[model samples]
Target chain A: RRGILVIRHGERVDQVFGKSWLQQCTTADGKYYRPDLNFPRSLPRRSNGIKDFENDPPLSSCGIFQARLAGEALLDSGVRVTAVFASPALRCVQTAKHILEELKLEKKLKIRVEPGIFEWMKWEASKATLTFLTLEELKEANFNVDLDYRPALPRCSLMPAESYDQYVERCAVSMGQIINTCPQDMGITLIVSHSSALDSCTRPLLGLPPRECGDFAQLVRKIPSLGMCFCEENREDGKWDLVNPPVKTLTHGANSVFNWRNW
Target chain B: AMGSATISRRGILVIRHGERVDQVFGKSWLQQCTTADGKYYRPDLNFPRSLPRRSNGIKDFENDPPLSSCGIFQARLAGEALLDSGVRVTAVFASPALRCVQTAKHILEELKLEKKLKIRVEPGIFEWMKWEASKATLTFLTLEELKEANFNVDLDYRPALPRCSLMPAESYDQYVERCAVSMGQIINTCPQDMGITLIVSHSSALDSCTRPLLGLPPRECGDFAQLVRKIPSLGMCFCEENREDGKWDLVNPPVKTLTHGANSVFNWRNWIS
Candidate 1:
């Protein structure tokens, strides 16, 4: 009866709030400040420059609400969970934190930030490596992240700048390790990540092969923010099968996020 | 009223109908999806698998449409949420429109039914009729017709505004007055003891029901179309009594707002890069 509940991160700041969010919220000397109630009042202190945040933006105010809504849905469905995991990406980590808070499990379970389960990992070497928030940084920002857990995929793991084949292989390895590492006594484990990760992680577990490159484009477009699916393990055969999500998916029209200052 | 055995008051949940086939598939859908023999067909995956068989068949549906396949799922999800919230719906009512009936029926499918609870079809609460663009006239399925179609029809119940009572034309004030009175009568039918009552209707019906209870006047929507745009599909309003005072007022809905983004074109670079 053990399973993995996969969820995509909520809406991102850059996509909704525009790129100017960083400039407007950051001090001339680079300290972050909150300009609006919708923007986060505090940000994690990191070693990287402020602009690096453009590539690793946080969730919007609405996105935060979405994360909590997803959590409320799970609670209403009566799905009990003993473990929570998320991509090192700020958005996923933040989503995990809110879900835990809503489920009233924040004190009992901390988010295991899995490096192997992170999104689209093959970045070109020319651009600076993605600077993810550290376990300490995540905690400093008040995220209930598990400091004890070490990553299965090390930072040393290199780049498919990833092919369709490589992405699924990485997902295969990550999901396998988590499945093996988890205790049978513990029930469901929730995995929070991107749309690509949600699909890649499940395909390999279900014994499906990597998709063709052409289909990959079509696949990611269908996954909306907070989209979710479940994979249950057959105790008899040890085979994993995809299950329909117990709760309904949240869906809305894409409203171009507005800025009050717009003339 | 029942004696001390009866509860003092009950909860009323009002909601709008889900997405419609006409709204999504506006052009040539009738020609494209239907057959030469007058049979209904689904041209797209979102179209409903089957439709309620009206006595007049497709002709009765020229201006009327059922919930799209997506809207059916929306209603099911709302029902699931309602089930999880532990709300026991003792009765269900809906507008005469096919979409509202379909939405109500789908939602009720999820609840733990004590007996075979039927959907009380009420034509009075149907949407603003004047908004229809067609001068050719629109029609609705009646109690006997819906019952014949195998829908869960409560034939014993009566409506405040009987079928054929609505005017072919009217002012906005009359529209509001008619709806407000109908809503009051609808709520009055369910005494304090019947538990939760659900009304499935169109968007404007929501304001008509709740605005009067909230002590607000009917909206003077100078730009009516823009006003309608603000309401989300399956938007909800909750009404309950003050156990002591027996006054029904609008309270926050028990369930979270159900939403999904429209499908968009897929980009290749995001995955490859």
Candidate 2:
């Protein structure tokens, strides 16, 4: 368990609740009606309100379940999970929240939200910074956020159209800061982030070249929900190595929605 | 020689497969998973590391997709529950669909029957066969490919549905008719001394294949989709021969528990026998 357990968040609401989930939940009078059972019982008042969710959606009901299940898997494996960190995205935070809950570490440890490990910036819109919940609002929503921790990457510091190399370097620097800043005896620090972060976080540390533009998307598609990458430091050589995971990756088949139109 | 292997009192357990990758992650999952050469590859951990070989060099899986990694775990859980019940599955049959076969393969592993029995990938037990497009577009892994993927395939078995016998777009009644006939053949195909046969297929297969045998008419499509959606992943149906007239009666489900919710997991823990 002496490694960084990098993983992607579970099912996001927009994907599972369908593309119109935001519209499905938002009321005409500016009130939010959780039309779906999988939606959060209460949503924090974001700066842009529900419209903020057009780009940033929380974990769906199933997404929460996926995180708890992952937590159970880690618990079963007896992975120490001494530290917890995640992307600034609400989905990743919620994924981290439920996982820590299942790990029974909700009271003992809090999640350190790091922009350092956010997904590639090019996927987002031009010159637009995301409207993530502030630390106080996240705490108000009952997420286990560390109030004392400063983000490795300053908020709003992300480039509008971050080149591939810059994004990779961003992930690498953040990862390095995490490893060097923490005590090695903290056991494994669980980093919950985007799919590309899985490979980008470790590739530079392993002394490997960055993935090509097209190849990155190809790699991103292959990472399943809750998929993990466990990277460790070779104590003798001080070089990092991506090792086989201590847990089995969760598997599933696709169950398409019943479209009566298609039928 | 000893007496016949077939027994008068036998059971058929029908199982539905777990979450599929195409349905879970979206069709784009298939887009990235397949190579330019028509060979299937796994880029994600949830996808199977190895794929069943498709017959011919013509590889296109847009029509058929395998179970997600969690789906495989779900099947193994069902298999474990059955194993705990002490009932021995003498024969295994799955729809030719890739996911069904994979589900059966994992179930056999859990039942410890993977070493004891080879699965009959029957064409007759397939689900609503009315393909959205042409039936000719359908393709499946060769038996040899199934074996290569560790599937215990019954290579010598003959399919009751036969090749190219399916309708391009059959009515609901026609669909049930094929399944009813297929179920009958599947039952008769069991060898003497076979106590039970495990049938793995699509959601509708559970009801359509069993209803006709029970003397009930098939449910209409409106009713079909409604009920099938209610059935959870790894849902099952149990039918047994309580009548000496050789008629089968629907019995209570043999496996009582199935774990659901979320798709994260690990691999350990000992169960008491």
Candidate 3:
């Protein structure tokens, strides 16, 4: 009777308006501009800050409402959710928090921040320039991440960003480990993560092949922001069933990360 | 930060379906008989009595009757209370009985979520007595008929038991076992992301299902005569899974009366006063 409920995080600040780093000045000659370089705060601070987007971005007001609505819907459904695993991204963490709050289960259920479900990075070269928050910094932010949680790759691993195949493989391995770690009678496990994370994690579990790099946009088009992809384990057959299929389009305000140029 | 030790928790909110026409008839649809020894007791009639006639001569009550006006109001109030309290409800299950269906529909309507979620018609949540009733009296509406009646039933759903197979009929102990098994299936299979679930069922089901889930003995039929004195229409029983031991606990004890104002049976005052 075990099942996996995959939730895409709600709208993030950058998705709503724009990221702060995008405002940095490029050379007049347009020859030496580095969008990845560190920059000071900019005018019209729509987002929380530049560093916020590195590893996390607080949910937008609309995102909060979406998360709350999702929570309310889940609560009314009466599914006994015992544990929640969320992406290290702040937006996903916040989404999980809001849902737990609506369920009145936050006090009893602490979120397990899993890095394996973090946003997909297409190029390994971007890892060095990317300013993700250290695990210590995230703990300081009061996120209920597991104390024992360590990134899959070391900071000095010198590995490039994951390839599409590598990302899918990692997701499959991580998801399998997660399924094995959870008790079979635990009822349901809620995984709050980014669109790519959900797609990568859920597709392999359902025995479906991973989508290609070119198909990422098409895949994103299929998964909605704050929407869910349900995977139920068929105890009789020892197989997984995709109950309610993911939405066919992104009905929410956030554009797909595949469409964003900065990533 | 809390300690790393984690325990799995789950819960079920078993609710008695709202009032029905039989309640007003002053005659139990469940059969009663007097023995030759001068003892009066309920018997396995195998079939229900002819439904009571309404003053208007409407025979609609002959089949599965819808909820009463008061029941509708109570259902609406319950929905409002849940919404106001900010309970996150993601899924809903209901007994196939007409009253239970209507109660679930009305609650979803009040919550403005009729289109968002479907009510899973689960015969396992039907009345305990009905499970042992005659096959003729156990017939329920089909998926199309239910949808035609505007109920948001899942057309793809199937009952755990067969359509009309009660060769031996379940005994009291057998019924309790079935209820316990059904409760376990519900708690173990419900989607994890759904924070809560709404189950619209019968009065006896509340006791049979909730008690077994809590690891308590089922109440005898005779016990309900005293039980009904305390439980009112639309009464709710909340059970939570203890993280420490993975056992279900009756978090909200079934008291003689609900302590909350919104859940009070006297909540009719909102409309009157």
Candidate 4:
């Protein structure tokens, strides 16, 4: 009754291009391109060619194979994934589609796009003069991207006008809402997303080391995927014990798989 | 409206490298065991090579080097598991430390994504999650030591240890600064449009990087960085966007938990709770 499975998509061809899959979808004249956009006065001009990386296409042939392998492994795990959640990114969506195909759950599953699973890890554009951009510039564009997708209403507590701290808190709040909406007492639900969101949200649950990609944790007895760490929960004693530890299942081998049941 | 235009955001993935061989020996060898006045295990207080190899130097066990074979194996496993998941690492940012470097190298080797991926070694990301030196020191000092030292303790009051020597060498403010500078530099310079950015680092470094980004409290070493013990090799991602007010806001954040099974299984949990 308590399991949460997390999965990531496979390598993409755009990776070689040094751009995001989202960038691959647009052209130089696309909406993202704004020569006159009001950027920070102190900031330097972001090489227009670097922005071109964003329009790179889907995964290369090898990337597709990676997705298929992911699907095959998930299907082989035998876990009854009741709900499939993923970021709306083309690569992630594609990966989810392949997984559904392998599991034969395509007909039964509804691939929902949840913004919470987007990536935060650093990426590299081409190293040439027109390519690679600084993290600050990326941060600027990321902010722009968020605004472009979900325009923050003026009334939002963590208003877009607020600082970065407030923004991250808002992200946490949003993720909390998603978890709240999940069927806690039902079958295992799978969330497919990017790096940063997973690190921030799961840190409250698992007492694992922080930072970096590829790090993971799990609780796999009954619900197999329901990994729990010391955070806050009602205990037998009324007094809250801040120090609470939980078991962890770190992902090791690429071929590893698991099975779950539907309630 | 221009503000309401639905702009898409790129996905990201962050992770720390596996354990290193030197970690098994503990950091004390450099800090305590080996010294100018003979090794900690030496009888006389003279001579350069007087100290035995086992005294402070590392033991040459094949299974447990700074990056042992097991560490390499773990790195490979991590790569395969990542491939199995839908997450694809587009770029890798690694710490300059030896262990993390090895872990990143192994992961690249296994995925065969090395040729295409660019690996950046950032000095800002060398150290892992760090504890407040002052607080950690205070906690380690015994009540008697505090009284004997007449230490003027105020806002920062930590538990006492038997001896003050065991206390951490750094101060709380210093540790915070280290974390801030390193994490800030990375946050400030990372590419915005990349799909996923992978980071290979230690526990403390990861903790420091995340807390600031998430708007959590300042670094607290007493608290575990990753909130989970099992998945020591943790990964994280964040999605950010601008708002109508013309400010950037994080929309979604995700964390991956890797599990041990021949099939490379993993689970996902939200840290928001």
DockQ of each: 0.07, 0.09, 0.01, 0.05
Show model 4 residue runs off by greater than 4 Å: A1-263, B1-12, B22-65, B84-88, B128-169, B224-231, B235-256, B261-273
lDDT (Cα, tens digit) per residue for candidate 3, span B186-244: 67655354356777887677677777776777677567434534455567777766555
Return the TM-score for candidate 2, rounded to 2 decimals: 0.54
Candidate No. with top DockQ: 2
Q: What DockQ would candidate 3 receive versus the native complex? A: 0.01
What is the lDDT of every predicted structure here? Answer: 0.72, 0.74, 0.59, 0.42
Tens-place lDDT per residue, model 4, A1-263, is: 33444555544544333444334334656433211101101222355653443432233333344444445445644645666665544455556666677677766776665554443312212212222233244335321112223312121122224333443454455445555555444555555554443445454334333433333322221221112232332324422222222222222122111111100
lDDT of 1 by residue, A117-203 (tens): 877754323235567778888888888888888777764573526665776787789888888777675478899998887678887
Give the lowest summed-lDDT range of ten residues in model 4 chain A.
A254-263
lDDT of 3: 0.59
Error of 2 at B44 (Å): 13
Superposition error at A146 for model 4 (Å): 59
- For model 4, residues B113-202, the per-residue Cα lDDT tens digits are 765664555545544323323333222223233224332212122212112333245454555555566555554454465355666766
Per-residue lDDT of B181 in model 4:
62
In model 3 chain A, the worst 10-residue window by lDDT is A254-263
Please tell me which model should have the higher DockQ, number 2 or number 3.
2
After TM-score superposition, the amount by which residue A243's alpha carbon in candidate 2 deviates from its true location, in angstroms, is 0.5
